[PDB]
């Protein structure tokens, strides 16, 4: 479980998600999952966000049991400052 404070840039936040209610990235599991950390991007520069991490929440917006479009909205309707709640698998 982690906190990631980030600054979105030219290429966005610099990573790609999957999952959510009705679009299960793993069977019987609607979590949002980071699937691709973009080379030389804000997250890749920050270095915390790893592949297979679970976005629990984005600033104030909780991504637990949300639709994919709901998740992507939340990650796309955000200023240059974004806080992230993630869960690092173990």
């Amino acid at each position: 479980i982690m906190e990631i404070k980030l600054i979105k840039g030219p290429k966005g936040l610099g990573f790609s998600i999957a999952g959510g209610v009705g679009n299960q990235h793993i069977p019987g599991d609607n979590s949002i999952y980071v699937t691709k950390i973009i080379e030389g991007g804000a997250a890749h520069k920050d270095g915390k966000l790893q592949i297979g991490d679970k976005l629990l929440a984005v600033n104030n917006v909780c991504l637990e049991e949300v639709t994919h479009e709901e998740a992507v909205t939340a990650l796309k309707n955000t200023s240059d400052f974004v806080y992230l709640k993630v869960a690092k698998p173990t």
Partner: peptide, 4 residues
């Protein structure tokens, strides 16, 4: 799947 979706880039942000």
């Amino acid at each position: 799947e979706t880039e942000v």
